[PDB]
Ligand binder design. Structure first.
Ligand SMILES: O=P(O)(O)O[C@@H]1[C@H](O)[C@H](OP(=O)(O)O)[C@@H](O)[C@H](O)[C@H]1O
Ligand SMILES: [Zn+2]
Ligand SMILES: [Zn+2]
Length: 65
């Protein structure tokens, strides 16, 4: 519900491509947006949980430091 768990996305937010059998879907755990394998191709380690959380390219560098 509060998180974008394929509830009805089927479309990245940035590239906004229609997720298909070729491209997968990945949402940013920080902002909470759905990004395609190309937009979500960046992860960063946060001191909040000591683990690399999946996030888009921007937030990845915005939270990595
Ligand atoms: O990739 P799938 O097997 O279909 O499932 C993915 C997981 O729920 C991912 O969790 P994560 O962000 O914790 O990886 C999420 O980012 C993606 O939107 C989902 O596609
Ligand atoms: Zn994308
Ligand atoms: Zn983000």
């Amino acid at each position: 519900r509060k998180w974008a768990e394929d509830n009805e996305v089927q479309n990245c937010m940035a590239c906004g491509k229609g997720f298909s059998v070729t491209v997968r879907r990945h949402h940013c755990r920080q902002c909470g947006n759905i990004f395609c394998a190309e937009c979500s191709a960046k992860n960063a380690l946060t001191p909040s949980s000591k683990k690399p959380v999946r996030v888009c390219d921007a937030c990845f560098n915005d939270l990595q430091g």
